[PDB]
Amino acid sequence: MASVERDETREHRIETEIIVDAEDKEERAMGWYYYLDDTLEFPFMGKWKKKSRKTSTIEEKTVEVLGMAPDDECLKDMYVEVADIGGKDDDVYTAKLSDIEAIDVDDDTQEAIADWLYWLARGYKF
Ligand SMILES: [Ca+2]
Ligand SMILES: [Ca+2]
Fold first, then answer.
1. Residue 10 and residue 14: Cα distance in Å, rounded?
2. Which Gene3D superfamilies does its entry note (predicted)?
3. 105 phi, psi to nearest 5 deg
4. Which of 77, 83, 89, 114 is 20 to 30 A removed from 123 (C-alpha atoms)?
């Protein structure tokens, strides 16, 4: 639980659109995956604020975000394909959406990310 709520409007829009028929874990994951992709307008630039290896601290890296991972990944958690801008600029990886923040993106893309970060802080429902 966390108080990451402007009002119960978010909970009701999750309930009446994203997960309305979903409660089996695969459906919960797919409901989130479908509406998050559709809201996000990839490609976009972001910071991979990777949870550190040392502690609950952050090891940031600057990345280009190509798209959400396959549905085969997105059954377990929200994930995104990413390419390192910092040095490689020629190779690709995958990151949790839970460890990404967008940079200079449109409002709808940024809202999907912020809303997912609220769900992350809330402690999930699947
Ligand atoms: Ca069901
Ligand atoms: Ca889309």
1. 6
2. 6.10.140.400, Calcium binding protein CcbP, beta-barrel domain (2.30.30.530)
3. -100, 170
4. 83
Which protein residues have their CB within 5 A of the ion that is ligand 2? 38
Domain encompassing residue 21: 1-40+107-126
Dihedral sign from CA coordinates of 26, 27, 30, 31 = negative
Solving technique: NMR
Give the ligand at the shortest distance from the Cα of 37: 2
Torsions phi, psi of 83, nearest 5?
Answer: -125, 130
- If one counts the domains in the chain, the total is 2
Residue type, 59: E
Ligand that lies nearest to the alpha carbon of residue 43, given by its number in the listed order = 2
Same domain, 77 and 55: yes
